[PDB]
Amino acid sequence: KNVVIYADGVYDMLHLGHMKQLEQAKKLFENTTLIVGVTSDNETKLFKGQVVQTLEERTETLKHIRWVDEIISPCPWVVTPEFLEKYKIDYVAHDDIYAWLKRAGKFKATQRTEGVSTTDLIVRILKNYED
Amino acid sequence: KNVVIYADGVYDMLHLGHMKQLEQAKKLFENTTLIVGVTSDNETKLFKGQVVQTLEERTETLKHIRWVDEIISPCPWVVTPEFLEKYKIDYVAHDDIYAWLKRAGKFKATQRTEGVSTTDLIVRILKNYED
């Protein structure tokens, strides 16, 4: 009755927004294994343009999160059907290139989540010292 | 065979340092319940002088951490023997006012942990834009 869920992302400077999203992926069914994929530094740099924490810091941080059952670090940038087969993944959690996942019934959307980001924290601190 | 461990702190802007410390408290024995106490805003302000995240943000964040089994939010600023009795706490994890805990065999130290703090992240980002 166990359902394997895969979610991938950069997970740079992880915050409540990411944690709630991982919670939602984990709770898509009563019995899950949540596998989390953490993109490589060189691919995040090239395809997003920047990355702050190394692959090791981003993976080490996710390890402490309650909902994460397994980590693939680094993961592939693009999910393929062979990847889904090789790891026995039943669904991919995401918040088009993803049309083949929806067409196979393997796409699960995770509603949007606001968190207290590093930016929010800096802004909140500096509001105390200048307008 | 279950051992109840209590750790209290502010847990402002939680990072890897805090997560590793909570891991260490959780793993002090093979079978534990880790209870975590989160200090109140007004007491943290008065006794530490400042606090960034509210009690709700600090508690909500700890809820997502793998090692945390129960949260007392807000917790008392000072641990008393009645508090230990009331919650059936066998040990207090900490990194003098704590001499009575050591004298009773209820004090467990958690070695020091370095993390990638918010400050470290800001500094690392700004090193890219100015010396």
From TrEMBL, chains A, B:
Residues the entry annotates as binding phosphocholine: 10, 48
The record lists CMP as bound by 10-11, 18, 95, 113
Give the Cytidyltransferase-like domain ranges.
6-122
Domain of life according to the entry: Eukaryota
* Entry similarity comment: Belongs to the cytidylyltransferase family.
Protein name (record): choline-phosphate cytidylyltransferase
Species, as recorded: Plasmodium falciparum (isolate 3D7)
From-to range in the entire protein, with total length:
616 to 774 of 896
